[PDB]
Amino acid sequence: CNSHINNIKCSQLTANLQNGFYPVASSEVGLVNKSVVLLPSFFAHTTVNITIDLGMKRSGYGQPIASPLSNITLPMQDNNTDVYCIRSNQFSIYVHSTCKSSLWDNVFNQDCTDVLEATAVIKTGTCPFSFDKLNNHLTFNKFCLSLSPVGANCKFDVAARTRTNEQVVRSLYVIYEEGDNIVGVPSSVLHLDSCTDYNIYGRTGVGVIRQTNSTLLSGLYYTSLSGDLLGFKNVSDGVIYSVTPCDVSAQAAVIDGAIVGAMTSINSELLGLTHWTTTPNFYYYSIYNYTVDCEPIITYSNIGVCKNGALVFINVTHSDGDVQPISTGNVTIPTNFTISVQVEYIQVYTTPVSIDC
Amino acid sequence: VTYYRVNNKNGTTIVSNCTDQCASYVDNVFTTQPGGLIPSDFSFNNWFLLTNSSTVVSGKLVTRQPLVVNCLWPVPSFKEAASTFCFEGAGFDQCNGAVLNNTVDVIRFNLNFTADVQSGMGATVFSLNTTGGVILEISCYNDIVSYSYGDIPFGITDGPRYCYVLYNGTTLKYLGTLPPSVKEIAISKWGHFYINGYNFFSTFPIDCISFNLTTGAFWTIAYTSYTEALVQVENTAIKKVTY
Amino acid sequence: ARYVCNGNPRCNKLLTQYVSACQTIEQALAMGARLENMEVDSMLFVSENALKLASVEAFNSTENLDPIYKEWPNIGGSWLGGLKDILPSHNSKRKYRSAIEDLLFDKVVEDYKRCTGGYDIADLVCAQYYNGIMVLPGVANDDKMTMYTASLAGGITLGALGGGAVAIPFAVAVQARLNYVALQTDVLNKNQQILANAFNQAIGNITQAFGKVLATVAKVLAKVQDVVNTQGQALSHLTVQLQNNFQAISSSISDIYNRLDPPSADAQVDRLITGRLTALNAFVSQTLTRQAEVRASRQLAKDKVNECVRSQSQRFGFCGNGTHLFSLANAAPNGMIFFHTVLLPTAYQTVTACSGICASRTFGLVVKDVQLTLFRNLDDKFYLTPRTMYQPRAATSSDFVQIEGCDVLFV
Amino acid sequence: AFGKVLATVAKVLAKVQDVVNTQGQALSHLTVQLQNNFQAISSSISDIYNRLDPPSADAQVDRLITGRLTALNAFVSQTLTRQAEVRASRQLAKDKVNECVRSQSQRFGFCGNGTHLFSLANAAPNGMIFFHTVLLPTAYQTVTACSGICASRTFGLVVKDVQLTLFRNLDDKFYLTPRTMYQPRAATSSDFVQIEGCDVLFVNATEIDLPSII
Amino acid sequence: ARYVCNGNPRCNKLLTQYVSACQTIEQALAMGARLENMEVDSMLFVSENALKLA
Ligand SMILES: *[C@@H]1O[C@H](CO)[C@@H](O[C@@H]2O[C@H](CO)[C@@H](O[C@@H]3O[C@H](CO[C@H]4O[C@H](CO)[C@@H](O)[C@H](O)[C@@H]4O)[C@@H](O)[C@H](O[C@H]4O[C@H](CO)[C@@H](O)[C@H](O)[C@@H]4O)[C@@H]3O)[C@H](O)[C@H]2NC(C)=O)[C@H](O)[C@H]1NC(C)=O
Ligand SMILES: *[C@@H]1O[C@H](CO)[C@@H](O[C@@H]2O[C@H](CO)[C@@H](O)[C@H](O)[C@H]2NC(C)=O)[C@H](O)[C@H]1NC(C)=O
Ligand SMILES: *[C@@H]1O[C@H](CO)[C@@H](O[C@@H]2O[C@H](CO)[C@@H](O)[C@H](O)[C@H]2NC(C)=O)[C@H](O)[C@H]1NC(C)=O
Ligand SMILES: *[C@@H]1O[C@H](CO)[C@@H](O[C@@H]2O[C@H](CO)[C@@H](O)[C@H](O)[C@H]2NC(C)=O)[C@H](O)[C@H]1NC(C)=O
Ligand SMILES: *[C@@H]1O[C@H](CO)[C@@H](O[C@@H]2O[C@H](CO)[C@@H](O)[C@H](O)[C@H]2NC(C)=O)[C@H](O)[C@H]1NC(C)=O
Ligand SMILES: *[C@@H]1O[C@H](CO)[C@@H](O[C@@H]2O[C@H](CO)[C@@H](O)[C@H](O)[C@H]2NC(C)=O)[C@H](O)[C@H]1NC(C)=O
Ligand SMILES: *[C@@H]1O[C@H](CO)[C@@H](O[C@@H]2O[C@H](CO)[C@@H](O)[C@H](O)[C@H]2NC(C)=O)[C@H](O)[C@H]1NC(C)=O
Ligand SMILES: *[C@@H]1O[C@H](CO)[C@@H](O[C@@H]2O[C@H](CO)[C@@H](O)[C@H](O)[C@H]2NC(C)=O)[C@H](O)[C@H]1NC(C)=O
Ligand SMILES: *[C@@H]1O[C@H](CO)[C@@H](O[C@@H]2O[C@H](CO)[C@@H](O)[C@H](O)[C@H]2NC(C)=O)[C@H](O)[C@H]1NC(C)=O
Ligand SMILES: *[C@@H]1O[C@H](CO)[C@@H](O)[C@H](O)[C@H]1NC(C)=O
Ligand SMILES: *[C@@H]1O[C@H](CO)[C@@H](O)[C@H](O)[C@H]1NC(C)=O
Ligand SMILES: *[C@@H]1O[C@H](CO)[C@@H](O)[C@H](O)[C@H]1NC(C)=O
Ligand SMILES: *[C@@H]1O[C@H](CO)[C@@H](O)[C@H](O)[C@H]1NC(C)=O
Ligand SMILES: *[C@@H]1O[C@H](CO)[C@@H](O)[C@H](O)[C@H]1NC(C)=O
Ligand SMILES: *[C@@H]1O[C@H](CO)[C@@H](O)[C@H](O)[C@H]1NC(C)=O
Ligand SMILES: *[C@@H]1O[C@H](CO)[C@@H](O)[C@H](O)[C@H]1NC(C)=O
Ligand SMILES: *[C@@H]1O[C@H](CO)[C@@H](O)[C@H](O)[C@H]1NC(C)=O
Ligand SMILES: *[C@@H]1O[C@H](CO)[C@@H](O)[C@H](O)[C@H]1NC(C)=O
Ligand SMILES: *[C@@H]1O[C@H](CO)[C@@H](O)[C@H](O)[C@H]1NC(C)=O
Ligand SMILES: *[C@@H]1O[C@H](CO)[C@@H](O)[C@H](O)[C@H]1NC(C)=O
Ligand SMILES: *[C@@H]1O[C@H](CO)[C@@H](O)[C@H](O)[C@H]1NC(C)=O
Ligand SMILES: *[C@@H]1O[C@H](CO)[C@@H](O)[C@H](O)[C@H]1NC(C)=O
Ligand SMILES: *[C@@H]1O[C@H](CO)[C@@H](O)[C@H](O)[C@H]1NC(C)=O
Fold this sequence. Notes:
The structure is cut from a larger assembly and holds 5 copies of chain A. Helices cover 3% and strands 46% of the residues of chain A.
């Protein structure tokens, strides 16, 4: 994959494309700015620090082993430190670890080195979210951590990652309910007339944000039947923004293993095609020198495409007309004849199938 | 639009003009119809759907809601900063329109506020008298507490407020943070305390409720009961009710 | 790819494993449409010489009229009070459409260039476009279908196929049709004004009935709208399947990757991919069945044009309930609307019919043409008359056949 | 054109192949449903009993049985619909044989685009292929047609057979000709009907024509 | 409502959230039958004078 024709080949899993029309993206994006719109409310941020102290040791063979006897520390709240809860509007969660080692059991007065060395990693166990994603703009009604497996929803697996293997030492339980009160944050800015990765009022996607003048939105945001965000309102101004995709489907016309032209709704160069014309429903880009009269090779709809990229439209069959039952004045009666043979197929029967249940 | 005030309480219908804030009066105070029904022409300003869900619900739904008004008491005036209401021994003497003699399930407080004012209006405390007699108090603070009571603002607040249930003046539970705007407070017989339609606190059934206002705090207090109705809701705010 | 994977670079990669499923889906729809376009294109045709005089403005003038008909100021003058609401008009909105067509289309209800403007909130059509669902024009689009019906209507008054556009009066064309129903013998008492008035009034009430949104009009509006509503629901049903989590944590692909790390997020997506491909397979199957149903209907539409519009049919009851005189047709959403102009009897004439004649060595005489009724008139002479219209003809010797015997019912 | 794999030939090949491909896909779709685990540990019945003891293995199989029976029910429903669609098509095939092959039809446009002469038919996969042999005009003859004849107590004469066109030839005689082929026939008295009136479009008769006309 | 919720007062309440689904189902069947009745009624007719001797 490295060229527009080869990207079509990759998509279709073929090394040899046939003459015809293939679906392509009008463009591709990546490495774009992030845009967020949060519910105004009030700033109130809590930094949450989890410290994992790993007690690594060694075996006769030397297979490094972590000790279930390891210590997870959550910040201090209500004196007990076995359950920490978030009681603020915004939060950030960070995990840090210290690796200690021993030759003698349960002394841990020596730094771990080399093959004993480990770093703690918190990974998804049974929760519908990763630990490291809690710093994205995830929203909760409630979020509280617990080292006690009592009346708790899902759990995270806390593992020691070494230079040899990885194993789970402890579980961290998390209590949560979905809602919009508590929002995760990395450590309300949007970028207009640009392709952006957005998170708007709890709706995530990629698209282009534009400022418009309308009164259509009754609530914070309006969506399509598919659930996609089509637009939203700024709570303070009442100004409406529209949201559209950064790219749309386009049809690439491929003849003899090359892209000859393509149809798209966006008036932007695609697939290396720089010349174009306009059709009733779309824009047509091609190799043809556009600012025709030819025979099309491939067709679809009422459109044909010629080898040189020229775009042709199909006419309706003409005839002289029917002979009318008129016997007054100068009339025409067919005189010279030839024979034509027309061929048609009609299905008469199906092929019966017997199935042994 | 021209605003006129009509009063037939003494048996003779009298017509006079209105100044003050007539538009607000027509947007908040209604005459109760026989059976306790709310007039079809009432805009439902500050009447929120009561829900247990944390999310925002909108559309046409049929639910059991306290939309039957046993007595509507408009623009209440209290002898002192504090007042007491009861779900049982309550007495209806200032009902606007028809009065229905039944037990009250919910007492709904339509709060008086103006957009973008942050005026010195609110309650110092709400005191809930449960069955056994345990008095639980709700009060909200400017910062996190770690006996002084606090302040529950009406309308727009200048910042965050942390709400606690008090007992012996000692915080008993953290409830949460108030919304940017407090428009309605509704308290049920069954122990549920709602803010703007959201269940904020739940406890044992309540015999009586009282509060102490800071320094016309309410548009109206409605003594209501539960009925089945079809309601049109926009952002948890009721726009139309068909019983 | 766009329907299942919403432009997400990371979903499209997973979807690679299902490329053969997507190819089956896309090819099945493409083949269905391809076959339809071929047989539809076979049905449609135009005639330039007919189109030239097919408009209302052409009919209201003398420019194209054959000079032999100097008594007629225009084409179908007396019939124009009805035809004007059937024939296409040049002086109108949306190029060349008829009054009834505008009412039928606007009372029922594609540019995708606009979906990228971004100056307003997208409507349903653009919202569907963004999900990979788009509607294409085919061969029988509305403009081509209109030309087809206009060419047929304009053929009625076209006098010759030699070249050019020489017209005859509509009344002349109609009189020619009356002769197929029954040979017209009553030449001294033309009923053209009566027939023309009845026609013009009937169309008046039909055009009005459409505008008002007449059992035949109510039936057509219900059927036309139903065809449109069905296709609408088919696509609305498909788009809402995208809201189905299919046992995933969420229906939104970007939400899954925003919340959950790749090694677990891919599993959540695999369930959504399987679910959405299943929805597409159901859609394709449903679509192909509808096309099969239409194929049968289309054959009827084709037979109606050939036997009611382009020619006189001998099939009783085929071209409306009554005795068929002529048919006109117009465009309709997804098809055609036919106007069957038929004769309706208001009074019956009683005659005393003769089975045959016994004449004198005796012999019988029977009528050669079995469609005619033999009867004796008040002047005691024999007349023949067809049974579809009372147009009595004096009987002659060339109308009879000699047979050996006589029946008891012979005169 | 068939050997090469002509619009009519291309249409037939596409339609014939499509009928065949559809039945093929219907059965290929059914067989691959056997690879569906239906939430079982495996799609293979012998694999389930090879790995898992009967008291638990039977449960795994019960899910596969339910799943596979469901697939068969879907197949049967789909099959029956196709048969209904063909029934309608078959009626057309039957009508074509009876009206195009076994007899001459009077139905315009039924047996091909043109004037029908004869039809032949052959076998095709799942049905029949029809060869409609039709006449195609290459040139038109112009004649000057007469609406009717006004003759003399005056009377009108009209043509008894409404499918014929009356016209006058270069020798000033009347001829009749059908409108489907220019095969002119001298007119005679047995071809005309007397009526009381005359139209404005009638031609004036002369005494020299009357002996053959009336 | 009766098919899905078997007269159970408590089920019908849950079914409120699906009223639009039920309306689609009931309307689709009603429209099908309505169209059929119109074209069937068009086909059928009687003649009293014929029935008298039928
Ligand atoms: C049902 O069956 C009928 C046949 O009975 C078909 O009707 C024929 O359709 C063809 C195709 O359109 C017609 O042919 C066209 O004639 C035009 C006018 O004739 C000129 O040229 C001829 C040459 O022989 C001269 O004799 C005549 O005097 C005129 O000078 C031509 O202009 C057309 O030219 C087109 O094709 C050529 C060749 O590809 C191109 O170079 C041109 O640029 C142009 O595109 C064409 O030759 C034919 O006359 C019709 N005959 C009759 C009797 O109607 C119906 O089409 C068919 N119905 C369906 C639905 O298929
Ligand atoms: C939503 O609208 C508010 C204003 O109502 C924007 O906040 C202001 O932005 C201007 C920039 O010109 C600053 O000068 C003001 O100080 C900001 N605050 C206020 C109270 O006006 C806010 O940025 C908008 N949000 C988004 C996402 O567009
Ligand atoms: C039918 O066509 C013929 C030509 O084929 C017409 O006859 C010609 O008429 C013009 C006058 O317009 C004369 O100048 C020519 O000399 C005539 N030619 C011949 C051979 O006679 C005829 O008039 C037309 N008839 C009708 C009713 O239109
Ligand atoms: C309400 O206000 C109107 C003025 O807008 C008062 O109208 C006056 O009525 C008296 C008679 O009762 C007239 O003599 C005055 O000239 C009117 N005033 C004006 C400005 O025209 C009306 O009386 C007030 N309503 C009541 C109950 O007093
Ligand atoms: C929120 O949930 C509580 C249950 O936890 C509901 O309380 C019930 O209210 C009804 C009155 O309609 C009583 O008959 C029940 O006994 C109460 N249950 C309990 C445990 O006290 C409450 O009504 C719900 N509120 C809303 C708005 O849905
Ligand atoms: C609702 O509250 C507003 C204040 O937010 C009250 O308006 C004030 O009333 C006092 C006493 O009459 C006046 O001295 C102030 O000048 C008024 N302020 C403003 C901005 O007008 C109002 O009276 C209250 N109304 C009700 C129905 O309680
Ligand atoms: C519908 O048809 C009737 C014919 O039955 C039209 O009624 C006639 O109106 C015309 C004048 O336009 C009169 O000459 C006739 O005497 C009326 N006949 C009647 C009343 O039977 C009626 O106008 C037509 N409606 C429309 C909109 O055209
Ligand atoms: C057909 O309609 C005409 C009227 O246009 C009927 O002619 C009338 O006949 C009655 C006797 O039945 C006379 O009293 C009238 O004077 C006639 N009016 C005329 C001549 O216009 C004719 O009878 C009708 N035909 C049938 C079979 O009823
Ligand atoms: C039918 O075809 C014949 C040819 O087979 C045409 O006859 C020719 O007519 C032209 C004049 O139009 C003469 O110059 C030729 O010498 C004729 N050739 C012959 C007699 O074979 C005949 O005209 C055509 N019919 C029509 C109506 O055009
Ligand atoms: C990102 O935003 C900056 C402005 O902060 C703008 O200059 C740049 O063009 C944007 N790039 C993209 C891909 O949006
Ligand atoms: C978390 O650890 C960092 C050092 O890496 C420290 O600066 C920060 O203050 C700590 N936050 C809390 C809440 O302990
Ligand atoms: C954790 O702290 C315990 C005391 O609770 C101590 O005995 C143990 O050695 C520590 N384990 C570590 C640091 O791995
Ligand atoms: C295994 O354990 C036994 C008993 O403690 C000990 O004698 C032996 O040396 C050990 N062998 C190892 C460490 O591989
Ligand atoms: C929105 O602003 C643009 C640019 O000035 C203007 O052309 C358009 O008409 C405006 N639309 C509305 C609804 O105000
Ligand atoms: C054809 O190509 C030339 C460049 O060689 C360009 O200048 C010219 O404008 C093109 N013609 C059209 C119609 O675009
Ligand atoms: C036929 O094709 C020509 C282009 O060659 C186009 O201009 C014309 O409008 C088309 N006419 C019809 C009736 O389709
Ligand atoms: C009611 O008030 C009006 C106005 O003050 C007064 O005229 C009337 O007499 C009063 N009615 C009674 C019963 O006192
Ligand atoms: C509320 O008011 C009552 C009555 O004046 C008083 O006894 C009580 O102490 C007050 N409580 C608070 C918190 O102000
Ligand atoms: C609560 O109600 C009980 C009812 O007996 C009463 O004794 C008690 O004083 C009340 N407490 C209050 C109103 O705070
Ligand atoms: C503190 O709580 C106890 C509950 O046992 C109560 O009896 C006591 O009166 C309370 N103290 C004060 C000062 O209210
Ligand atoms: C025909 O033209 C005349 C003007 O000469 C106009 O008054 C009349 O309305 C036109 N008829 C139609 C049907 O357009
Ligand atoms: C015709 O006349 C003859 C001679 O009188 C008679 O015998 C015969 O019955 C008559 N025919 C009929 C049908 O009455
Ligand atoms: C037939 O000839 C007569 C006598 O000259 C004339 O009055 C009549 O108009 C002619 N017919 C036609 C149709 O011209």
